[PDB]
Amino acid sequence: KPRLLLFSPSVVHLGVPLSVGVQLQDVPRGQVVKGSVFLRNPSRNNVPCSPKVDFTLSSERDFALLSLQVPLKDAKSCGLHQLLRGPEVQLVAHSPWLKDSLSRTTNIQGINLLFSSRRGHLFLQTDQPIYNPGQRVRYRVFALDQKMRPSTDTITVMVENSHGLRVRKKEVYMPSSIFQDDFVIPDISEPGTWKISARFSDGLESNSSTQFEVKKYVLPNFEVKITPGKPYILTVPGHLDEMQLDIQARYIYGKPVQGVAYVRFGLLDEDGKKTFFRGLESQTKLVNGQSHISLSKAEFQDALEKLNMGITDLQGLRLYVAAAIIESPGGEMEEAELTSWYFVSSPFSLDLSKTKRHLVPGAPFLLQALVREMSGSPASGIPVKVSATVSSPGSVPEVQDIQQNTDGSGQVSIPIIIPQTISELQLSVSAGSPHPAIARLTVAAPPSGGPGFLSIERPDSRPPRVGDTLNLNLRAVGSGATFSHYYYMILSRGQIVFMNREPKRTLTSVSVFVDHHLAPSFYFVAFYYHGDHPVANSLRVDVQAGACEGKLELSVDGAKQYRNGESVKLHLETDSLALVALGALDTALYAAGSKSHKPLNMGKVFEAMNSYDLGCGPGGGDSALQVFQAAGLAFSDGDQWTLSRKRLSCP
């Protein structure tokens, strides 16, 4: 009956400490256990290439969170890098209490993890997005560790040519976590996109890359932007909406542009074949720098019939509009093109990725949807209708209809109720009217006869910020109240962070303080033992993207306008001593560039931090082992264990 749990992340990143959580379940008050935990290679020999970490547990302290280092030297020593097929290492928890008390066959219990080689973060920056051939390129690369603090490790940068050939390689010994370097593009370089990579010398797969386009150009004077009236066209047989565009020309310094806009229309398929209408062209002057144009239904249908086609064929095609305005009397001409005006049959969209799957019976099932306009910002105030059919539990199926208007950012949380002994649930979601966006989802109930279910309820369905406490309501449904505590844990960025023990009451509430080491998302895994079987549930929370751990405000007090040669006072403020990496860039470079090349902002940093995570899906499982596997854990008590990951990426 007594059991010793063991939790650890599914994937080990060599050279970075491993968060191993041990727990003691159903132990008499008079028993105190002590042992050690270490990594181990199963093939070479039982040679522990990790410093053994001791743990002591008792009735009053039945769990302990240990940090287990995995140094590079020991890991290389045991032949982990000499394995032929399969990068797999084992973690073992050895204690003499197992043999003495449980009389087990052996006193070794553990899991089969899957090591990797990624470590730390590297960020690369270049002087400007687009370069002229034969122009110097200045790039700097910052290096940080997994804790997001500056690192002094050694990287090996390398430039690549447009064809893919290496052009320059270097190795650096950073004492300041920044490396700056210059190189010259060959004068005869053909147009293309060059890539700069940077990886840790020890870690083979710890690379990070940036791209810059090489193209022969002269910096423009003004930018031309084409904006559709709506980002979509309704090709529904009932009706076809109006096609109207606004073309705006603006000098780089703000003043409008006087000139003549020449616009041409055509069809464009996803393959990349353009079919222009020999006609329908527009030639209009610009008033206040903006010109309003439109294509009437009659002329559009005439053009379509002249092309030997009907309006039914406009399924994947998009209307392609090209413009080439000529400034007057300067004479300079600039061109713009639009490749995002799709033909659609529904002006809305539905994203049911937030909705859980295979959820517990006897508790409300929350359907979460994000209604978004076709190629646009999330909608608000658009009614959403859900028809949920609870399939045969033994009798005829029963249907329910619930309608709710989206509040803000498109979020809608519709609590469809589900009875006990449910078989399956079928969900038909329709957003907006007329011309609704329809989505479907089917959920299969867990097999009957289980030891119970755990329901995790979130009273607030909005993304918490940083520094705000979060409350979840744990409850046990369809089970016997024989236990006394709920055990829960948090999983952020692929490593166990928190592990606690909450007493059991009616509607137990747990509070988690959203700190700065939980962003941009975390998994809340809770469970309890109903006799000799685990009952578990999980949940994913997306912390809202906001400010940094520190701060940096570059502010220039005064008006935006200036004059060449003026002196500008630039203020920098932080919370500690920091190496501010400054850079001032022209804006006409973006106009010169054919394709958008977004810079390094907080979105990229947040994606970098959470790319190390092992979680997969919005949470929930048919059993305890499935829940832990979805979360990203490695559980093994003696009778149950999770099979090793087959590949780093979830199916």
Binding site: A363, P364, P459, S461, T506, L507, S509, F513, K569
Partner: protein, 638 residues
């Protein structure tokens, strides 16, 4: 046996619509309904008489709306409400009172000079914040209290806006003048706003001296750091030299510190000076550092321009020396908790001078996992799960800012009592809501949770919920419950009718185990963002491509509700900043409205009758279940 119930607001108001909720439980067929209101002492006359029929289609849910005329036939005036439920009759006597409205006075500036013109507007509103045409008297009083100007205005046809102007003579009493406004009908309620007359003063440039913190901590080795800021009257910064000298202040005697005199360069327009702790300790020749507690410091700075010889002086007196700067309080916690279910607190941390704190961690003592961070308004919201017994719950909160020691942290202790079961039946109702701020257009999910023995669970088929807002009864309904379910979620829409914090009261009734009747109820107080029902935005119509230049024409764009009347005024922004004591803001208006709520206890009561009375409701049934009569027009002090 069928049970008939009647629910109505605790206090009824004259010439205002009042909703009466009528119910029949375990009653078959349909039942005719006639509700009448009479005088309490003798039932001499009928003030109103309405009728309706409760149909089984709507689960015998009915709401009858009546208006109590301002007959003033009799004299705390009471009226008895008698409802005939078919043959059955239920009677309940309810208190009656009338409210007049609100006056808001807007002044462009708070500091004038002899000769300038005082411009002020009077806004007339009712309890729903709607314009109303009444007659209001406006007076202006000098510091001695002698009314110098008296006016009698009528806001009828003016859309609730009354403009007024006063011309200050060249020789007037100097001090704090006041403006008094009150409706003619009810002169007992006077609304006052005050300003100052002062004397003509105009320095060469403005200088502001303030420390980074709002106090001084004795054991803080960093010392006291002060930031001197200077800028001209036209916006540009000042570059010069500032001479700063600190000084202790033992009540009223200033033991100025000679060694702390410093000279600092003001560059970019901002400086910085630090007083070392050693200097302050050696200044008073006292070996004990704790002896300086309560001896506030002061800073005197003298800024000298670098170009000419212009000199201005600034001061900042009253920087306290404290070892326990933060004091901790409870604000909106209930006092009765359902045992075995979560209990929501709320905490307010304030500075020594009485201002709300900011980013001060709080935490309950012994749990350590219920931490939070104090918000902009000083409110930190926590939750603690309660024990399953019925002994009182003692909860202690402590601030956990790192700089201080454990013995110097704030601490407040509160005791809560269990909700009293009717017959020790251990039957409870629990309403769980999000503990944040909502906005109109969002949807709120209220989780009705029920616990009782697994022998009478099937005898409850519904929950009844009532929403109270602005004292009035907002809406009611039903929550059909499928048997076997413990938790039932109500998706509740939020509209602009919920703009000030509303209250939700739910209950269910069933036959008792012994054979009597049972009513179990709970309530929650939910706060939503304070904003106008409509919208009003002022922006620049012209293209934003130039800084405004003196004397040139500028185009403004006002966007608002159609047919509204918009009034404007422009201020220097030098007097707006110092007006932080009181400004005309939507939050202040909604707070003024929130100060006249019928019920005052946050979210629970000792019994079901306590729950119904605290929320501002009355509940009478054909059986022997009723809430105690309320006679006072204001509930006891907090």
């Amino acid at each position: 046996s069928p049970m008939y119930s009647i629910i109505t607001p605790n206090i009824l108001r004259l010439e205002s619509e009042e909703t009466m909720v009528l119910e029949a439980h375990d009653a078959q067929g349909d039942v005719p309904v006639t509700v009448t209101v009479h005088d309490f002492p003798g039932k001499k006359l009928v003030l109103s008489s309405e009728k309706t029929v409760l149909t089984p289609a709507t689960n015998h849910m009915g709401n009858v709306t009546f208006t109590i005329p301002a007959n003033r036939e009799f004299k705390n005036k009471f009226v008895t409400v008698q409802a005939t439920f078919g043959t059955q009759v239920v009677e309940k006597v309810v208190l009656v009172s009338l409210q007049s409205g609100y006056l808001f006075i807007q002044t462009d500036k708070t500091i004038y000079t002899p000769g300038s013109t005082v411009l002020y507007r009077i806004f007339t509103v009712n309890h729903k914040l709607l314009p109303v045409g009444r007659t209001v008297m406006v007076n202006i009083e000098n510091p001695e209290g002698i009314p110098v100007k008296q006016d009698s205005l009528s806001s009828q046809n003016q859309l609730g806006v009354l403009p007024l102007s006063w011309d200050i003579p060249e020789l007037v009493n100097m001090g704090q003048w006041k403006i008094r406004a009150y409706y003619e009908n009810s002169p007992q309620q006077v609304f006052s706003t005050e300003f100052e007359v002062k004397e003509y003063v105009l320095p060469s440039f403005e200088v502001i001296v303030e420390p980074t913190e709002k106090f001084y901590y004795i054991y803080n080795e960093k010392g006291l750091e002060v930031t001197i800021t200077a800028r001209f009257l036209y916006g540009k910064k000042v570059e010069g030299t500032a001479f700063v000298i600190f000084g202790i202040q033992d009540g009223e005697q200033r033991i100025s510190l000679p060694e702390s005199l410093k000279r600092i360069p003001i560059e970019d327009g901002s400086g910085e000076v630090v007083l070392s702790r050693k200097v302050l300790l050696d200044g008073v020749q006292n070996l004990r550092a704790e002896d300086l507690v309560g001896k506030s410091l002061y800073v005197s700075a003298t800024v000298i321009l670098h170009s000419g010889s212009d000199m201005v002086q600034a001061e900042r007196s009253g920087i306290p020396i404290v070892t326990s700067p933060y004091q901790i309080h409870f604000t909106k916690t209930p006092k009765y908790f359902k045992p075995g279910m979560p209990f929501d607190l709320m905490v307010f941390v304030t500075n020594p001078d009485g201002s709300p704190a900011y980013r001060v961690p709080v935490a309950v003592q012994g749990e350590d996992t219920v931490q939070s961070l104090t918000q902009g308004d000083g409110v930190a919201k926590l939750s603690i799960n309660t024990h399953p017994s019925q002994k009182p719950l003692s909860i202690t909160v402590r601030t956990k800012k790192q700089e201080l020691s454990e013995a110097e942290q704030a601490t407040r202790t509160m005791q809560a009592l269990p909700y009293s079961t009717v017959g020790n039946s251990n039957n409870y109702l629990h309403l769980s809501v999000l503990r944040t701020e909502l906005r109109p257009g969002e949807t709120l999910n209220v989780n009705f949770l029920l616990r009782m023995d697994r022998a009478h669970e099937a005898k409850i088929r519904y929950y009844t919920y009532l929403i109270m807002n602005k004292g009035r009864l907002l809406k009611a309904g039903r929550q059909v419950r499928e048997p076997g379910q413990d938790l039932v979620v109500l998706p509740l829409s939020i509209t602009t009718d919920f703009i000030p914090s509303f209250r939700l009261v739910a209950y269910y009734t069933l036959i008792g185990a012994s054979g009597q009747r049972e009513v179990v109820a709970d309530s929650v107080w939910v706060d939503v963002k304070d904003s106008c029902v409509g919208s009003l935005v002022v922006k620049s119509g012209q293209s934003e491509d130039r800084q405004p230049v003196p004397g040139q024409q500028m185009t403004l764009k006002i966007e608002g509700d159609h047919g509204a009347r918009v009034v404007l005024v422009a201020v220097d922004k030098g007097v707006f900043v110092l007006n932080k004591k009181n400004k005309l803001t939507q939050s202040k208006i909604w707070d003024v409205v929130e100060k006249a709520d019928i019920g005052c206890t946050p979210g629970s009561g000792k019994d079901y009758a306590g729950v119904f009375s605290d929320a501002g409701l009355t509940f009478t049934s054909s059986s022997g279940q009723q809430t105690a009569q309320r006679a006072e027009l204001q509930c006891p002090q907090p």
